[PDB]
Design an enzyme around this catalytic site. Structure first.
Site: not given
Ligand SMILES: [Mg+2]
Ligand SMILES: [Zn+2]
Length: 314
Positions: A62, A66, A101-102, A215
């Site tokens: 992460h 990514h 998103h992360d 994802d």
């Molecule tokens: Mg996530």
């Molecule tokens: Zn992700």
């Protein structure tokens, strides 16, 4: 580099430098014309891309690479499937959602936060703890004056953009995977999606479905990419097992495996029970994406061969 040469399904951010990754993100904004559509200041776009990257932490999986993988894959999914119903606002929203998103991920799952009674779990009442944190940070970066890529959107456009970013990021939580799978099965049962440009709720659902698909980019890339990323995720799982032990917290059993055999065993289970049934529904609703079933089968056979050589050498 030509677009049809950069924007292919073999892209992996693992083999790229930070400078090239910033360039790839810019090209994605160039090709989708969202810069001229909303008069995006390229100084603010470059500053936003910089603050997003630094707000990611150096985890095995992460990480910022990514996030670029998710953005690039989201670009391919939208370009292939959504170009005839997605709005110009939603297109920009998906770019911000994929990259953000992360944000601030630390290699720990929601279960860790819930079991450890963490500050984030207390604030968010155990509900999609990580994803709520990612989305909240996404707007804290996006709404800093020097990073306001969306400064020119009017009132109704920003409301739609924000609702799309929130819904898509929140739906990357695996706890809502089967919720979206069941809705997808019902959609395929009555013929598929119809009049997506007229239905803002179902179109938003499609976007969440697509971001979630992007994802899970490991089984839909060449196997060398699949192997490297899955092993980086396995390292995060083993790292969390170690931390949960030091804190005397309970650990899930599938996170303890730390060799090539258990990596192949786990990914075969992940493909057969999560990714492959998902893409079988996705391919029915969007037949242009059924070539990914061949990539998933190819990687599945490659994982089954590894787990086979371990069954043999008992
Ligand atoms: Mg996530
Ligand atoms: Zn992700």
């Amino acid at each position: 580099l030509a677009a049809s040469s950069l924007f292919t399904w073999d892209f992996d951010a693992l083999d790229k430098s930070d400078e090239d990754l910033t360039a790839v993100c810019v090209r994605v904004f160039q090709e989708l014309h969202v810069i001229e559509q909303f008069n995006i200041d390229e100084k603010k776009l470059r500053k936003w891309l910089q603050k997003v990257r630094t707000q990611y932490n150096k985890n095995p999986f992460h990480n910022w690479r990514h996030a670029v993988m998710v953005l690039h894959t989201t670009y391919l999914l939208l370009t292939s499937v959504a170009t005839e119903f997605i709005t110009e606002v939603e297109l920009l929203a998906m770019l911000i959602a994929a990259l953000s998103h992360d944000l601030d991920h630390n290699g720990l799952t929601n279960a860790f936060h819930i079991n450890s009674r963490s500050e984030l779990a207390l604030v968010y009442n155990d509900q999609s703890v990580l994803e709520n944190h990612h989305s909240h940070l996404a707007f804290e970066i996006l709404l800093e004056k020097g990073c306001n890529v969306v400064e020119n959107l009017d009132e109704d456009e920003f409301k739609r953009l924000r609702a799309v970013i929130i819904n898509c990021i929140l739906n990357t939580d695996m706890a809502t995977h089967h919720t979206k799978l069941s809705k997808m099965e019902e959609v395929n049962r009555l013929g598929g999606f119809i009049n997506l440009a007229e239905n803002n709720d179902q179109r938003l659902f499609v976007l969440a479905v697509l971001l979630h698909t992007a994802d899970l980019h490991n089984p839909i890339k060449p196997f060398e990419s699949n192997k490297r990323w899955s092993a980086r995720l396995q390292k995060e799982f083993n790292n969390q097992v170690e931390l949960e032990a030091k804190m005397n917290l309970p650990s899930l059993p599938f996170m303890r495996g730390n060799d090539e055999e258990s990596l192949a065993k786990g990914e075969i289970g992940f493909i057969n029970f999560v990714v492959k049934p998902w893409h079988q529904q996705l391919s029915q609703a969007f037949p242009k994406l059924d070539f990914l079933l061949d990539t998933i089968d190819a990687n599945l056979a490659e994982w089954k061969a590894i787990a086979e050589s371990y069954r043999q050498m008992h």
